[PDB]
Design an enzyme around this catalytic site. Structure first.
Site, PDB file in Angstrom:
ATOM      1  CG  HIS A  64      -1.959  -1.152   1.059  1.00  0.00           C
ATOM      2  ND1 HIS A  64      -3.228  -0.924   0.573  1.00  0.00           N
ATOM      3  CD2 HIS A  64      -1.850  -2.486   1.255  1.00  0.00           C
ATOM      4  CE1 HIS A  64      -3.880  -2.066   0.534  1.00  0.00           C
ATOM      5  NE2 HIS A  64      -3.066  -3.037   0.943  1.00  0.00           N
ATOM      6  CG  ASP A  69      -5.148   1.947   0.480  1.00  0.00           C
ATOM      7  OD1 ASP A  69      -6.172   1.248   0.516  1.00  0.00           O
ATOM      8  OD2 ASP A  69      -4.016   1.535   0.115  1.00  0.00           O
TER       9      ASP A  69
END
Ligand SMILES: C=C1C[C@@]23CC[C@H]4[C@@](C)(CCC[C@@]4(C)C(=O)O)[C@@H]2CC[C@]1(O[C@@H]1O[C@H](CO)[C@@H](O)[C@H](O[C@@H]2O[C@H](CO)[C@@H](O)[C@H](O)[C@H]2O)[C@H]1O[C@@H]1O[C@H](CO)[C@@H](O)[C@H](O)[C@H]1O)C3
Ligand SMILES: C=C1C[C@@]23CC[C@H]4[C@@](C)(CCC[C@@]4(C)C(=O)O[C@@H]4O[C@H](CO)[C@@H](O)[C@H](O)[C@H]4O)[C@@H]2CC[C@]1(O[C@@H]1O[C@H](CO)[C@@H](O)[C@H](O)[C@H]1O)C3
Ligand SMILES: O=c1ccn([C@@H]2O[C@H](COP(=O)(O)OP(=O)(O)O)[C@@H](O)[C@H]2O)c(=O)[nH]1
Length: 450
Positions: free
Chosen positions: A15, A114
């Protein structure tokens, strides 16, 4: 710089890598960059002299809900639902005090998070700040998530219903039922998280996908239908590697060894940043690698093997002249080396996309989540690798490795990988899907404060 972008990653390697690649691309286009990050799993801020870091959410003294969560192993991911449930007030404070401290010549264009930080949409809305989402997994996985209500009605999300496993999924024939069972085995947790991620992604100002049109063309109509905001498909590994955002020290001694290997003669092996196997499976993998008779570079993360600190169950000298085990490498730089003939991957999306972007054909294993869908799509739609979809057997591992790297029968897979890399490169040229996605994204962000 007139225009600042705040980015807020999920603090895990798969991520952090794409959002700091995106940050660099946006810096290259003239934006100033602030990164909001947990102290937990922070990258080396000294690698990013051109970015401002602000550490949030787990500053001392720590919350009851986060204070004693483990820092390694799959359980560390408990931070994701906890920060979504409890982080809104602190994120709003941090965004406010940044905007209050800002110079009068500079303004914040947007917040990019995200997709898993679904809580951030309401926080951004409350400040009249636009939120864009970065999808760190594939369009195909998003298509599967939006189909979960139908998978549920068919009984595919019932762990106890072990029927139809090798059949094509009804209404979703690119998947076998067993792919859906694997992907959504953690259904009690994923049911709530994925529904919220979908709703707050649809509510966002724009969706950036780490992908390219020619990779996932079958899935574009679904994202245009489901997400009213614009979607931008940019294959971040084609812009830059993620070496600067590594959470672990690189073993760079591997390049001197790769330089002693003939072209396309080395199997690169890495089962991820989080993955774990029994001793039974780890020794079966080791035997398969030896049985293949191919040279290999195997990244084994400490804790990969349940019961050992590292690779203690492996005998000294085992693996031969042919094999090297290391803890960590600069993976995309290894995939780019001429020695690499194939990549045995756990099918994480960053690893899959890096391999595609370097033209390296794959052997796929999976540890659930989005991995079985990435393995199925790459193996059966694109045909750029072989899916070991029935566990670990030394014979089957040997055959798969030889098929991709040596067998004339596997030439079409090696050629498909070469051509897909070429399609990724063409996508970045003027008029290409990725070039136009990036030019549009820059124009769109520049328009948000008009
Ligand atoms: C949403 C998530 C909630 C989460 C909370 C923790 C939970 C688990 C792990 C389930 C078992 C029990 C439990 C308690 C546990 O063992 O901790 C649960 C499901 C996956 C998770 O996200 C996963 O968290 C891991 C850290 O623990 C990350 O390392 C994964 O990122 C990595 O991100 C890559 C980039 O997306 C991905 O390709 C790779 O496979 C993955 O390993 C990320 O993958 C997510 O899984 C979701 C599952 O539906 C997907 O929709 C997302 O796209 C994907 O990003 C973490
Ligand atoms: C705001 C914007 C984002 C935007 C980004 C480019 C983007 C897409 C058109 C949506 C579909 C995927 C994608 C990737 C797409 O087909 O892009 C097209 O790809 C062609 C090559 O296949 C190019 O020739 C075309 O110029 C390009 O528009 C998207 C929406 C509306 C849009 O203005 C543009
Ligand atoms: O030895 C390694 C192993 C992995 N990675 C990087 O770690 C990330 C792993 O992300 P992925 O989505 O493949 O799976 P995860 O590890 O999140 O499950 C990728 O960018 C890899 O290139 C790396 O730099 N060195």
């Amino acid at each position: 710089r007139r225009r600042r972008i705040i980015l807020f990653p999920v603090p895990f390697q798969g991520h952090i890598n794409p959002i700091l690649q995106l940050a660099n691309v946006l810096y290259s286009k003239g934006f100033s960059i602030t990164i909001f990050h947990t102290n937990f799993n922070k990258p080396k801020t000294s690698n990013y002299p051109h970015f401002t870091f602000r550490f949030i959410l787990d500053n001392d003294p720590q919350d009851e809900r986060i204070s004693n969560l483990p820092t390694h192993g799959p359980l560390a991911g408990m931070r994701i639902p906890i920060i979504n449930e409890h982080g809104a007030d602190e994120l709003r404070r941090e965004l406010e005090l940044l905007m209050l401290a800002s110079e009068e010549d500079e303004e914040v264009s947007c917040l990019i998070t995200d997709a898993l930080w679904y809580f951030a949409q309401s926080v951004a809305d409350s400040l009249n700040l636009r939120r864009l989402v970065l999808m760190t997994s594939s369009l195909f996985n998003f298509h599967a998530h939006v189909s979960l209500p139908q998978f549920d009605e068919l009984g595919y999300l019932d762990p106890d219903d072990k029927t139809r496993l090798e059949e094509q999924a009804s209404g979703f024939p690119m998947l076998k039922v067993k792919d859906i069972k694997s992907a959504y085995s953690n259904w009690q947790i994923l049911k709530e998280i994925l529904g919220k991620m979908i709703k707050q992604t649809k509510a966002s100002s724009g969706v950036i996908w780490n992908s390219f049109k020619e990779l996932e063309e079958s899935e574009l109509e679904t994202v245009i239908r489901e997400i009213p905001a614009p979607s931008f498909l940019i294959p971040l590994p084609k812009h830059l590697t993620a070496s600067s955002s590594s959470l672990l020290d690189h073993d760079r001694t591997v390049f001197q060894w790769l330089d002693q290997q003939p072209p396309s003669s080395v199997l690169y092996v890495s089962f991820g940043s989080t993955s774990e196997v029994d001793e039974k499976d780890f020794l079966e993998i080791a035997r398969g690698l030896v049985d293949s008779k191919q040279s290999f570079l195997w990244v084994v993360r400490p804790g990969f093997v349940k019961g050992s600190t590292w690779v203690e169950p492996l005998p000294d000298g085992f693996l031969g002249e042919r094999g090297r085990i290391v803890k960590w490498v600069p993976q995309q730089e290894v995939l780019a080396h001429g020695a690499i003939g194939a990549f045995w991957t756990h099918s994480g999306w960053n690893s899959t996309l890096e391999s595609v972007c370097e033209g390296v054909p794959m052997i796929f294993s999976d540890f659930g989540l989005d991995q079985p869908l990435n393995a199925r799509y790459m193996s059966d739609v694109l045909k750029v690798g072989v899916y070991l979809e029935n566990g670990w057997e030394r014979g089957e591992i040997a055959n798969a490795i030889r098929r991709v790297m040596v067998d004339e029968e596997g030439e079409y897979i090696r050629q498909n990988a070469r051509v897909l890399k070429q399609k990724a490169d063409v996508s970045l040229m003027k008029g290409g899907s990725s070039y136009e996605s990036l030019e549009s994204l820059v124009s769109y962000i520049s328009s948000l404060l008009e």
